[PDB]
Write a protein that binds this DNA or RNA. Structure first.
Length: 756
DNA sequence: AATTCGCAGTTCGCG
DNA sequence: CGCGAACTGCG
């Protein structure tokens, strides 16, 4: 199985290293025969000679164009003559590429920014994370000495905990009488001890939690001041810290540093992404937190050091149990994109799609288009029309069916071959024309993108089939992870079209897809009202809720099924309305604010506060019991006696503060907030005491009794002392609970005023 | 650093 | 200075 790739230099020449685990065994294949290159497009072939003479300086070294090669490729399906420019060393490319594109005789250059090792995996058609190979995983977390205002890592590391299938231990340099704590004399011995453990456990995967921004920058700076060789790598190297713009990320050669923090971000939407939060969110058992100053004083006074022990022990234990769950999922995502687990696990949705297209593009001899420079990214400004959203018949309805399309936007792409290479291609025999916007899409050949979309969805379909007939439950779970990722890969195509930074961005492709979507959704709605007498209560992009007023619970179901038969015959290609489910009751608040309950009693919400991190758990909780009292019980009164009793629990301060915390995210540098709400209030006030505040931090604040701006009374939740803090009850009534149930209960002749 | 669509609370500035 | 828009966050 392939694990990662990189290169080392050997006498000025690159050497690809491929890290394999072929049957329990770590192996390193070396490839000295791979040449870094990029692509040039010229005015005449007669320019190649003046281009080849182009030369650049690196680190005192002179950079030359090794050799040139003429090739034919397809740029956007058109045949294009291009000169492949070859180089002796990968680091030659970023030096010279600029000085080449500025040549008069060169129109542009392409695939000039592919990481040598990633390019190896493409060009050679190699795929990471492939095979039956069980990986040895080790998680680890640290604890540090935190005194405020200190520089980063000035204070020593107090503990280093780690976990695997055999359990957890903690390495520390004070006495703690716990059978899983190992005592040593000095912070240095502890580090060199942990360094030994990793060497003799020889894990394939090193699992942290935010190790890219904390645990590995500390372990490095401390290894600096203490002067320790941090030979974690299977080749003996130190953790290689890399700068991914905003933050950092750490690699460890011969292994896979699996930082879960970026995995949980992309994969799960949670209120806060603290390790403690995430562990309770994934496995349902609590995990208590121990805060920095508690760690400090407990370490200094030498008291209650057992408590800091189990915190650290449970940081490592959780982090393994977590990495255990999320690793195969990201293993299959690695296999699907064709790039290292380390890479994809840190990648955004757009980057994931592009690496996959970059692979397919190379397989189909398609010159990849560049990424937009500043100007092109500016002309990628004006937006397009999205879906059709129907201003709903606000209120409660009974006996309801939700019908939607099976994969509207991917199915539209395959059906009408929406692809930048088919868009308006002259000289075809057949075209599909897109509504409202009228782009022509050539039908004579499958487009680049639609060819992949179909291949994906078909492959997804074979997989489910192999799942159901397979016998190896390890295999089944893996397959399942793959197709779920294929689903999400498929369903990431339309956005990629309108993603302003994308290499294959096609605005035209994107608005086309939404224009069709609206024709298909609108026509299906007219044909269910006029032709089949349903009433369309609400409709959003790819589906609608409908009912036949006054008809039976089991009539509506049946006549719906009849309309599927009807409408599907009328829908071209893979377009297809399907029966999603039936809901004995459903309340519709506004556009994109709804809640249906099925015949079993499960309640599903959409756009509702009950599911937002920026609303307090007391609101979301009360709104839910409100939704139960209507949909599940029909008790409109109880839905008011519930609010009337919850408001009294706040006016008498009888409700836990832990419910009143509001979580919001920071999306920029604090210097860039044109206007300061309450989370930037606390954030500014927090980084003023010196805490790191990245774009992405979740501020978890609470609103205190007082007057004025909401922010002037906000405090981060950790600083909340209930004995010397009276939280603002009036706010959590008139700004948090009531406005979240008042829209549901105004529909019954109830005003906020008869809700306290 | 996937898209458009849309609700709404906080703040501040305008008549 | 009551109200509406800019700013913001997030499904």
């Amino acid at each position: 199985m392939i694990l990662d790739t990189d290169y080392i230099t050997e006498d000025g020449k690159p050497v690809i290293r491929i890290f394999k685990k072929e049957n329990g065994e770590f192996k390193i294949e070396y490839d000295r025969t791979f040449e870094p290159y990029f692509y040039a497009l010229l005015k005449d072939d007669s320019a190649i000679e003046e281009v080849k003479k182009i030369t650049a300086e690196r680190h005192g070294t002179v950079v030359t164009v090794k050799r040139v090669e003429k090739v034919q490729k397809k740029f956007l399906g058109r045949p294009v003559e291009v000169w492949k420019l070859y180089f002796t060393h990968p680091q030659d490319v970023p030096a010279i590429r600029d000085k080449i594109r500025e040549h008069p005789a060169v129109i542009d250059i392409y695939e000039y920014d592919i990481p040598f090792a990633k390019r190896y995996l493409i060009d050679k058609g190699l795929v990471p994370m492939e095979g039956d190979e069980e990986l040895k995983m080790l998680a680890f977390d640290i604890e540090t000495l935190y005194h405020e205002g200190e520089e980063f890592a000035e204070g020593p590391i107090l503990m280093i905990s780690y976990a695997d299938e055999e359990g957890a231990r903690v390495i520390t340099w004070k006495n703690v009488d716990l059978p899983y704590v190992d005592v040593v004399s000095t912070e240095r011995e502890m580090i060199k001890r942990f360094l030994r453990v990793v060497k003799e456990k020889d894990p394939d995967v090193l699992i942290t939690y935010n190790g890219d921004n904390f645990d590995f920058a500390y372990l490095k700076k401390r290894c600096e001041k203490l002067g320790i060789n941090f030979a974690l790598g299977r080749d003996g190297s130190e953790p290689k810290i890399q700068r991914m713009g905003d933050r950092f990320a750490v690699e460890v050669k011969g292994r896979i540093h699996f930082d879960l923090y970026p995995v949980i971000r992309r994969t799960i939407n949670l209120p806060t992404y603290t390790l403690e939060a995430v562990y309770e969110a994934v496995f349902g058992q609590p995990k208590e937190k121990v805060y920095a100053e508690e760690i400090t004083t407990a370490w200094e006074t030498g008291e209650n050091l057992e408590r800091v022990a189990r915190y650290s022990m449970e940081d490592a234990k959780v982090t393994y149990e977590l990495g255990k769950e999320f690793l195969p999922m990201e293993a299959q995502l690695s296999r699907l994109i064709g790039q290292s687990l380390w890479d994809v696990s840190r990648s955004s949705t757009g980057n994931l799609v592009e690496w996959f297209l970059l692979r397919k593009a190379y397989e189909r001899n398609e010159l990849a288009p560049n990424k937009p420079d500043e100007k092109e990214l500016a002309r990628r400004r004006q937006s397009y029309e999205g879906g059709y959203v129907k201003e709903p018949e606000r209120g409660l309805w009974e006996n309801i069916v939700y019908l939607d399309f099976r994969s509207l936007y991917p199915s539209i792409i395959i059906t009408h071959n929406v692809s930048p290479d088919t868009l308006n291609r002259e000289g075809c025999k057949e075209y599909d024309v897109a509504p409202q916007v009228g782009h022509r899409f050539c039908k004579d050949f499958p487009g680049f993108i639609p060819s992949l979309l179909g291949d994906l969805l078909e492959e997804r379909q074979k997989i489910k089939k192999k799942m159901k007939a397979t016998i190896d439950p390890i295999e089944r779970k893996l397959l399942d992870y793959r197709q779920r990722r294929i689903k999400i890969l498929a369903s990431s195509y339309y956005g990629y079209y309108g993603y302003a930074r994308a290499r294959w961005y096609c605005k035209e492709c994107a608005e086309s897809v939404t224009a069709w979507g609206r024709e298909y959704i609108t026509m299906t709605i007219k044909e269910i009202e006029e032709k089949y007498g349903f009433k369309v209560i609400y409709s959003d992009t790819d589906g609608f809720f409908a009912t036949i007023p006054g008809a039976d619970a089991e009539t509506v179901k049946k006549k719906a099924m009849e309309f599927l038969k009807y409408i599907n015959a009328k829908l071209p290609g893979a377009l297809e309305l399907e029966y999603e489910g039936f809901y004995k009751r459903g309340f519709f608040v506004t556009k994109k604010k709804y809640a249906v309950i099925d015949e079993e009693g499960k309640i599903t919400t959409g756009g509702l506060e009950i599911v937002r991190r920026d609303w307090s758990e007391i609101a979301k909780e009360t709104q839910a019991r409100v939704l139960e009292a209507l949909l599940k019980d029909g008790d409109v009164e109880k839905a008011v006696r519930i609010v009337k009793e919850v408001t009294e629990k706040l006016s008498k301060y009888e409700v836990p503060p832990e419910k009143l915390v509001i979580h919001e995210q920071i999306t920029r540098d604090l210097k860039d907030y044109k206007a300061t709400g309450p989370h930037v209030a606390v954030a500014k006030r927090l980084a003023a005491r010196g805490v790191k505040i990245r774009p992405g931090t979740v501020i978890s604040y609470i609103v205190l009794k007082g007057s004025g701006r909401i922010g002037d009374r906000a405090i981060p939740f950790d600083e909340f002392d209930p004995a010397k803090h009276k939280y603002d009850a009036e706010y959590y009534i008139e700004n948090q609970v009531l406005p979240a149930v008042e829209r549901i209960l105004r529909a019954f002749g109830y005003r906020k005023e008869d809700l306290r």
